């Protein structure tokens, strides 16, 4: 595998992974916006032949009413290349990128209830905590957990 930084000329194929892996689809101008505004926190996982196999496209949510924090928008990898320890490596590389560039107080995402493997991986291994159950989030009609993770211990481990 390979985990590396978000070069913009790559990212216009990882949307091809989006349309092939997870149903929540986005506009490409969203990708060109979050490829220039914060290029550090989003990462791309590849294999040898240059084919895209996984990505994290993330976001630092700008909110002046409280402390600044991050917001994971998309995590995906292919089912043909799964169960190798990809998603946790991409997620904590993105987390350490956030804590090394602009001090992420907490991270947050939204995940549906019907999936079990992703729910397990966010739940016990990478240790998210369920903070709010938001009703009727996705289009197909499933309620979604709004998960959060505290990164103060990660901040004091990377500050040493």
């Amino acid at each position: 595998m390979n985990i590396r930084n978000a070069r913009p000329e790559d990212l216009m194929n990882m949307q091809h992974c989006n349309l092939l892996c997870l149903p929540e689809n986005y506009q490409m101008k969203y990708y060109f916006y979050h490829g220039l505004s914060w290029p550090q926190l989003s990462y791309i996982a590849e294999d040898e032949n240059g084919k895209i196999v996984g990505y994290v496209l993330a976001k630092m949510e700008e909110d002046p009413d409280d402390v600044p924090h991050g917001h994971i928008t998309s995590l995906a990898v292919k089912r043909s290349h799964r169960r190798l320890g990809l998603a946790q490596k991409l997620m904590d590389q993105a987390s350490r990128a956030m804590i090394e560039n602009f001090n992420a107080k907490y991270v947050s995402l939204h995940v549906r209830k019907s999936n079990r493997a992703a729910l397990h991986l966010y739940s016990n291994t990478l240790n998210f905590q369920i903070s709010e159950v938001e009703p009727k989030y996705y289009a197909d009609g499933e309620d979604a957990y709004a998960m959060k993770r505290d990164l103060t211990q990660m901040a004091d481990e990377l500050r040493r």
Binding site: Y26, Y30, E134
Partner: protein, 95 residues
């Protein structure tokens, strides 16, 4: 509640007034910047001023224009840059 980034690009196009920087003696820099800029402008002017006195024949130019299909400006550059001869100019456009 899913917005799909509708308000993400709205404040990209917002109106704002940009900041002001205190003037502190930039003239000593921009003097040598303008001198270097006038040097490359003198070179880039001297290119077209030395190659401006080149005769142009019409039939060979229209034959090249029929046979490789670009605009007239780049073909005129390529024909003035090859000393008015058609053959090695066609070789260089073929290379």
């Amino acid at each position: 509640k899913h917005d799909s980034g509708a308000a993400d690009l709205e404040r990209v196009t917002d109106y704002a007034e940009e900041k002001e920087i205190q003037s502190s003696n930039l003239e000593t820099a921009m003097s040598v910047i303008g001198d270097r800029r006038s040097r490359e402008q003198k070179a880039k002017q001297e290119r077209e001023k030395e190659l401006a006195k080149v005769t142009i024949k019409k039939e060979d130019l229209e034959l090249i224009m029929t046979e490789m299909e670009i605009s007239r400006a780049a073909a005129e550059r390529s024909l003035r840059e090859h000393m008015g001869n058609v053959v090695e100019a066609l070789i260089a456009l073929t290379n």
